[PDB]
Amino acid sequence: ESPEQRATRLKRMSEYAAKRLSS
């Protein structure tokens, strides 16, 4: 129980990914 550190990494792909259902 510590996703706080794994947060940034969990969403370290792009600040604003292209809108899409699958992409």
Question: Could you report how far apart the first and last alpha carbons of the chain are, in Å?
Answer: 30
Element (H, E) at 9: helix 3-10
Distance CA 17, CA 10 (A): 13
Expt. technique: NMR
Question: What is the separation of C-alpha 6 from the centre of its chain, rounded to a whole number of angstroms?
Answer: 10
Give the residue among 19, 23, 3, 21 at the shortest CA–CA distance from 11.
3
Distance CA 8, CA 23 (A): 21
